[PDB]
Amino acid sequence: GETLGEKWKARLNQMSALEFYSYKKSGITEVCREEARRALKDATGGHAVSRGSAKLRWLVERGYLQPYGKVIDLGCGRGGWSYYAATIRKVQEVKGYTKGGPGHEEPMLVQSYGWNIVRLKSGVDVFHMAAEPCDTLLCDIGESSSSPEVEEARTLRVLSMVGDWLEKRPGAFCIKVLCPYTSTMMETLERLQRRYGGGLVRVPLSRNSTHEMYWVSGAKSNTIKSVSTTSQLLLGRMDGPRRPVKYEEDVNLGSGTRAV
Numbered sequence: 477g478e479t480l481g482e483k484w485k486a487r488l489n490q491m492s493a494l495e496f497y498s499y500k501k502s503g504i505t506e507v508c509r510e511e512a513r514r515a516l517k518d519a520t521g522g523h524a525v526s527r528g529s530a531k532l533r534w535l536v537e538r539g540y541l542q543p544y545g546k547v548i549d550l551g552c553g554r555g556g557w558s559y560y561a562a563t564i565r566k567v568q569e570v571k572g573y574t575k576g577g578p579g580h581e582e583p584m585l586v587q588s589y590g591w592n593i594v595r596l597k598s599g600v601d602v603f604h605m606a607a608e609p610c611d612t613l614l615c616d617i618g619e620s621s622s623s624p625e626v627e628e629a630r631t632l633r634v635l636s637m638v639g640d641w642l643e644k645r646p647g648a649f650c651i652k653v654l655c656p657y658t659s660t661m662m663e664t665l666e667r668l669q670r671r672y673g674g675g676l677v678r679v680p681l682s683r684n685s686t687h688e689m690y691w692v693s694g695a696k697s698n699t700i701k702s703v704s705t706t707s708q709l710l711l712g713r714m715d716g717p718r719r720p721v722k723y724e725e726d727v728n729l730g731s732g733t734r735a736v
């Protein structure tokens with residue numbers, strides 16, 4: 477039968493443009509980015525290069541993963557996850573890879589704390605990269621589509637690639653799951669959790685217009701329960717008034733080099 481997430485996606489696509497604009501941020505958590513954006517336009521100051529640092533911070537501060545050692549960041553974009561990881565005491569090296577080029581984000585070079593242990597490489601298609609051993613595996617790849625089947629096909633592609641890296645047995649991981657809400661995806665995620673561990677978490681900084689969840693090494697949740705709970709939350713926010721955004725301070729990543 478049709479899943480709750482599938483019902484959500486269909487209703488999402490039916491919304492008027494004005495309905496959608498309000499729904500997408502209704503009741504979500506958001507970091508204030510005005511200060512960081514203006515500074516990145518005008519390398520110090522501790523500003524995060526994207527709102528991605530705050531998403532990974534949310535997971536790390538709650539114990540959903542504990543980065544350490546050599547960190548590989550697949551789909552690093554501007555570098556928000558890589559620069560956040562470099563501030564963590566147990567992390568020793570961060571290697572980010574991203575496609576870049578026209579139409580896509582290129583790595584930004586900033587001097588937040590630990591910048592000297594970060595290497596971001598653009599021009600790389602991770603689907604044509606040989607997997608390498610690492611201690612912490614991060615991946616934030618998954619482009620939204622109005623078609624749930626396209627989201628499924630894209631997520632299956634990401635997860636097939638990520639499995640090659642997980643075979644090296646990193647002790648910590650955080651993998652974006654763009655589409656967790658179809659029957660095929662739930663079965664796939666259950667099998668992956670049985671093989672590699674971890675569990676799925678919804679980060680409240682995600683907009684209501686995406687069903688993305690993060691498969692993280694420090695969770696133990698049931699696939700069906702965690703996905704359905706997220707679908708119910710997203711469906712419930714489609715009814716009634718616009719709920720206020722919960723704003724928090726953006727992450728300050730400090731400055732300076734690290735001794736290694």
Ligand SMILES: C[n+]1cn([C@@H]2O[C@H](COP(=O)(O)OP(=O)(O)O)[C@@H](O)[C@H]2O)c2nc(N)[nH]c(=O)c21
Nearest residue numbers: 488489490491492493496620621622623685686
């Ligand atoms: C611009 N837009 C996007 N969506 C839906 O919202 C999903 C995500 O839309 P997005 O958040 O604008 O893209 P992003 O995740 O890359 O930032 C899309 O795949 C569509 O299903 C939209 N849905 C409605 N009803 N109206 C819109 O204008 C609209």
Ligand SMILES: C[S@@+](CC[C@H](N)C(=O)[O-])C[C@H]1O[C@@H](n2cnc3c(N)ncnc32)[C@H](O)[C@@H]1O
Nearest residue numbers: 526528551553555556557574575580601602616
């Ligand atoms: C959602 S962004 C991640 C944001 C990042 N975590 C941050 O905090 O700034 C994902 C990035 O993955 C990149 N990407 C998508 N497919 C890729 C591929 N096949 N190889 C390398 N990078 C890819 C995209 O270009 C995009 O910049």
